[model samples]
Target: SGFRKMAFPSGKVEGCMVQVTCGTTTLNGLWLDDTVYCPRHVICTAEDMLNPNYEDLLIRKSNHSFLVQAGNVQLRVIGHSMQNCLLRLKVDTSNPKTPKYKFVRIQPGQTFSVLACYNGSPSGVYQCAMRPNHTIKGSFLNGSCGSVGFNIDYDCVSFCYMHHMELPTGVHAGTDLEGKFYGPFVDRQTAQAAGTDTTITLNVLAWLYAAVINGDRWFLNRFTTTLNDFNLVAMKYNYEPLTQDHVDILGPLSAQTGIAVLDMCAALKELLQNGMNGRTILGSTILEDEFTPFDVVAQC
Candidate 1:
């Protein structure tokens, strides 16, 4: 049997032609005009003299049937006072050369957003006479007028009333009396801690994005009362108790509130203890067995 023969169609071989124009004149200078070559030319001769105004020039040839590689080419701005400058690019090979070009206008003190085209039939080169007025700097946290606002407000009238009435005089007397009395205190340490606690409670109330807001008024009333109780005890006794009433009331409320008041307290205790070179009391666990009115009232 005779072997069957097949013929393949001629594939396209792509080439690049770069034409650089500044104003109405093509930058057909000696450096570029001398280096570029045509496929038909074998040897450089006097008859084949370099065309100084060569509008169309071949810059590269492709190894693959459909690829072209071109070296970097630069166009220099001709005049110092050139204004409203525009860069144009055109590509053509057919008899009726319908050339396509892109134009970009240049302005003083404004940086241009350059459009770059790679590995294609037509590409553009830009030459701007002016530079940017200022450099752009980035930031992670920019403090501008755009980021300030007022939030919510709450009054602890009930807490103050409970403190005045319920807590004992001995518990509210002397050093502890200084705590119950809310004013400009001379001691920075006591004043700072009081301010911090007030801020924490306010923030916790403000953060109503948790399940605590959905709880019954009874739970809320109890929770707030317990918190007030804790504060009053803390001020009166000069010490606070970690009873189940405190934890049972606070833990669920804290979990629901998403406030993490316990966590904040633990962290504050750890920081204070570390600063004072003392053991952190935050890690102390409150078991059901340890829950006693004697333990609670003794501390009070």
Candidate 2:
């Protein structure tokens, strides 16, 4: 047992003694400064690791990294001119979509700011600042002050979309492939009998439709757009604004991976319901272990 949380004690760094056990063998290690040091070797690095106690299982190799800040680091969003416009703010730290700074309304001509002090307890995803993290984003909504603009003190870094899955043949970057296809499938039994392709198609369609109907204007726009109008640049400010150069990549990346993850989750749900033989399943149970795609934009 070691490092129950990635969190640091307030105003101090709390190090834990990590223990890795395999069968009858036990490996003792130290967890300090985001590194796992053992007499055997450096077995784990926090950068490559996801959240601690993930799936409530024993620790493994790190799979992701975090941005650690100390001393007097500050994040400021300054506004110069905004008379009748209001800027709606959202920060995506760890959990995508769900905002840490929710609906932070930046008034016409003021700055919205936060600071990381001498001993900040970096707990949540936003506090630790992971790669492909959502630093700060604003949606310019028209108020009595027209359209306001935003400027931040720090330069936002870009992250490559490395997470992916092998997509089926009918799917492409952004295309319908065909306009009018019949048999979306009304019954699960019917779909299952039809084939694996039909089953997956039904699952994907269900997820996309659910997201589009329930999501905000941003989600709705992306869901409805076709290949010709699937313009990332023009739609940057649609709902959740993407970094300038990122538009080209994350748009499709989110699209395809979103489909993959949803499909996986849906299929897993079905499998568990009918295929698991009524066994008590643990959180560690995975239908597809080989496919590990990072959710850059909370696509999943």
Candidate 3:
């Protein structure tokens, strides 16, 4: 009996090279697109040398602000050889230019796990370095790099309802009152749902209507403070939340709220133009000594 001998490449393997290959029964290579292939495995070779083909790497950098669901958070580094490769994770873009965070080292054919702490910075980018050696790399097999950007938030209120009202005992609440607003005051879910429906109703039918809207400025400001509080607790306890599920749910929501705040200013402008008297709307007590005050009085 005779068996096929596997072939491996040797040399500088400059630019891009296939450093690892394994024999498996369920291995097959096929072209996925004009310039790429699908089902990338340990045996794939670099087709282009001049460009050194790269892939987009997405990283979840914050877990405190986004409402990420299970299996929704992911980080992938494509177009790299797996042979003896080690993935190094670090936060090298800090203000002081010093690596203040811990580093994670992952071996070839291994998935890297990371617990990204929110730095509260607008631009949260994580750096990843790949090399053949753990510490040293010869001139031939020097260093390769990739990176990804992430935004953070606590919950995504834009797409879903945030408030609800509870009905009194022995009282019937219709869908408008039961499934929608249940009690005296509307909750976050109900508020968002109402807003979305109002937009559709007004925009589609072109009806002119105005409603009192409460901004989340206080809630967000408090949320930011709460995040710092939690970070302090984690530091004191020497523990942190590190999971894809956690990041997926919390990371994106923070970023979403930040954007919502910016858009709210525009919404306020429209409300003011639509015959909404700021003085009467906000009340004299609250409006006094604020900016400009007007007294609608009767003339002789």
Candidate 4:
């Protein structure tokens, strides 16, 4: 059968928003993929054993067909979707102007049609399918930085999240963060002493601040390119875009032999000892206040 080739936010999260269409039940709303591209489709129920919901959600009838299943699912923003639908989902795999929608056709007494809902909520929820697999489905979570879904965009997220909304520096509560600036790769080990949620968390911000200070498109473009490859895979798994204080520290931003962790201990040693603030963080004051969805931080 053909696959929608949906995206996953995190281990199995989602974009900020998503668009799902199936049998007169196409709904679009805040999902892990929508608003700001994260990754993975955030299905309400099943989040216990490792990553089974994805596998669980994959429980389509033997040789089953889908309505929309390939390409990427982008995340949207809030005020975007109303009704405590908790979150929303939207997937785009269309190539035809007039496309035919298909689903499991009972297949001469197939396994039995089950209601697919979020967290198995039951009421006020949209169902897809189960066994006979059908109905059912499902941010750093800060202002626009966290809530807004990501497009196939790579740069949009950083531009919107930081310059648009924007995190701090330093490690804490498992976050490998450290107040510092990444420059040359001196003693790799010594440099690593300074870190954060993940190099991705720092790398993006590092250049973001650099762009703010110098208005250099080079710095900004590099940051987004880093994410393009990263988000591409993230989209594959529907991993929600990581942002702000509650950022995603997961590393290996690229498909390399190993994940990269930044170390500014050389040029940023002092900043590492200092903190993520006006002194260390370039144009830190630009944010003005705590980040929020759609709230533009830097008009620049």
lDDT of each: 0.22, 0.22, 0.19, 0.23
Q: What is the number of backbone collisions in each predicted candidate, taken in the order shown?
A: 0, 13, 27, 91
Report the alpha-carbon TM-score of model 2 versus the true structure: 0.17
Best first by TM-score, ranked: 4, 2, 1, 3
Using all chains and alpha carbons, the TM-scores for the candidates as numbered come to: 0.15, 0.17, 0.13, 0.23
lDDT order of candidates, top first: 4, 2, 1, 3
lDDT of 2 by residue, 1-300 (tens): 211112112221111222322233233222222332222111223331232222222244222211122223221212111111111111122221111111122211122221111122222121121111111122211110111111222332111111001122221010011111112211011211212221212222233333332341122211232322323322332211222333343244446445433333343334433454543222223222111122222234
Residues 42-125 of candidate 4: C-alpha lDDT, one tens digit per residue: 232223323334334434311111122222532122222211112222333222322121111221001111111121111121
Candidate 4 regions exceeding 4 Å error are 1-65, 69-196, 199-266, 276-281, 285-300
Residue 261, model 2: lDDT of: 30
TM-score of 4: 0.23
Ten-residue region with minimum lDDT total, candidate 3: 291-300
Better of 1 and 4 by TM-score: 4
Model 1 TM-score on a 0 to 1 scale: 0.15
- Candidate 3 per-residue lDDT, tens place, 114-184, comes to 11111111112122111111111111111111111111123210110101111232111111101122223
Query: Which prediction has the highest TM-score against the true structure?
Result: 4
lDDT of 1 by residue, 124-181 (tens): 2221111121111111121110110011113110000001110111111001111222
For candidate 1, what's the RMSD? 31.3
Give stretches of model 1 more than 4 Å off.
1-238, 257-262, 274-300
